[PDB]
Design a protein around this ligand. Structure first.
Ligand SMILES: CNc1cc(N2CCC[C@@](O)(CNC(=O)c3ccc(CN4CCCCC4)cc3)C2)ncn1
Lengths: 195, 236
């Protein structure tokens, strides 16, 4: 369980029912600003969690569409994190204003208990690594908020693999799984290994 | 890792952010600016239609109960303002939403009044000089001012030190941002204060102590040949 796990797949077609329940979901979707808005809406996000948190990266019109999916999926937006983008000197690196930041909506669902609310603050200041990479500070914040719990990232890239996380994304290296219960249902649901 | 540091030391990550000519634009704005006008008015009991002409810009800063942590307006109250009744067919809005449910309900308002959101401007509050809502997962250190367009330079970040308790004032930088957009000269500030009155703006609010607004006098500043000035050019 604890070490990094991942699955090369198309999140549209994966039966995510086989993965079980998670304390935290994160998603960095390819908004059409690609999955059409209907595909985004019909993602089977609701089966992934019963109680816990969703982190959902938004930009442009996805700031409104993502709120829609968030409520659609059964969540209540309770926070919004912004990542202020800097360089190595900590200086700051949408046809109206230049864009200094990325937004990530925080959704709650059910009534999660035993989480460390208030440990971090809703602003991240961190250097832009490769383009489209997200700052690793978000994993630190997520861990302090729900230590040692199951987590899943949707539309993650190979560098996103992290202990306690299963990472789903189409540019990953195959299927790498270790939690026995997941291993089971995957062989049951996918006995021949295609999807 | 500035998030680990804040956990360790109480210094919010923003504390460690560092930091042509223009300037001509600022004097073009300042020369174009109409005299300041201001009107005390209880906006709840006020037919907003008495404010003519239609405005090129509206800056809306209702007093949310969240601003008093240590009369407040609910988003129930705000949503029922007939802002579309005083907005020019092509016009902009800048709505201060705070950091709670206003980020959602403020977007409802914009849509209800006919705008679409084109920018999300964040006021990031440093606490260099002094290192929670029940629903809050995180410590809240910023405020959002949403920009809306209806009809057909600068960053989206305001960084200042957090103001002392009970000080509800928003950074004066929002005005520079707005005025550098050069959206016209009919500028309305709802829930403004004596402290916010500004050349080039009409300020309406319940706590104003004085008023000088006259509809015909106000309308006189935009009669021909001045009807379509961006506010960023020479006197016609
Ligand atoms: C077709 N159906 C799929 C698709 C799919 N992907 C599509 C190809 C790319 C992918 O491989 C990895 N995602 C990204 O590279 C990606 C990175 C960053 C952003 C924006 N971002 C900037 C960083 C901070 C937040 C905002 C958006 C996307 C996932 N995966 C599974 N099924």
């Amino acid at each position: 369980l604890f070490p990094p796990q991942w699955i090369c797949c198309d999140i549209r077609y994966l039966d995510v029912s086989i993965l079980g329940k998670f304390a935290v979901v994160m998603a960095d979707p390819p908004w059409d600003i690609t999955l059409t808005d209907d595909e985004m809406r019909r993602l089977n996000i609701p089966v992934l969690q019963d109680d816990g948190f969703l982190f959902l990266w938004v930009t442009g019109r996805a700031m409104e569409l993502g709120r829609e999916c968030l409520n659609l999926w059964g969540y209540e937006r309770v926070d919004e994190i912004i990542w202020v983008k800097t360089n190595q000197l900590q200086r700051i690196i949408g046809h109206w204003l230049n864009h200094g930041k990325e937004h990530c909506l925080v959704g709650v669902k059910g009534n999660p208990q035993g989480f460390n609310q208030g440990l971090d603050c809703d602003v991240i200041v961190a250097e832009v690594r490769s383009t489209s990479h997200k700052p690793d500070e978000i994993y630190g914040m997520i861990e302090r908020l729900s230590p040692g719990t199951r987590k899943i990232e949707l539309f993650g890239r190979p560098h996103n693999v992290q202990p306690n996380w299963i990472t789903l994304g189409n540019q990953l290296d195959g299927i790498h799984l270790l939690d026995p219960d997941v291993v089971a249902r995957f062989k049951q649901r996918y006995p021949d290994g295609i999807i | 890792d500035y998030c680990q540091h804040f956990v360790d030391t109480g210094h919010r990550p923003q504390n460690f952010i560092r930091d042509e000519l223009i300037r001509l634009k600022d004097e073009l704005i300042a020369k174009s600016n109409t005299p300041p006008m201001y009107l005390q008015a209880d906006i709840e009991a006020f037919d907003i239609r008495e404010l003519t002409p239609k405005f090129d810009v509206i800056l809306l800063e209702p007093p949310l109960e969240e601003y008093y942590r240590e009369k407040c307006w609910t988003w129930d109250d705000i949503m029922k303002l007939e802002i579309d009744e005083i907005a020019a067919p092509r016009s902009f809005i800048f709505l201060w939403c705070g950091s709670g449910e206003g980020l959602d309900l403020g977007r409802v308002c914009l849509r209800k009044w006919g705008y679409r959101r084109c920018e999300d401007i964040c006021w990031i509050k440093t606490n260099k000089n002094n290192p929670l809502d029940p629903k809050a997962v995180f410590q809240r250190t910023k405020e959002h001012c949403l920009m809306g367009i209806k009809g057909t330079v600068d960053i989206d970040l305001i960084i200042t030190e957090e103001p002392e308790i009970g000080n509800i004032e928003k950074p004066v930088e929002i005005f520079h941002i707005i005025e550098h957009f050069c959206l016209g000269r009919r500028r309305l500030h709802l829930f403004g204060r004596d402290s916010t009155i500004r050349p080039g703006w009409l300020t309406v609010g319940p706590t104003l102590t004085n008023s000088n607004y006259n509809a015909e006098t106000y309308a006189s500043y935009f009669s021909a040949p001045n009807s379509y000035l961006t506010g960023c050019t020479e006197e016609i």
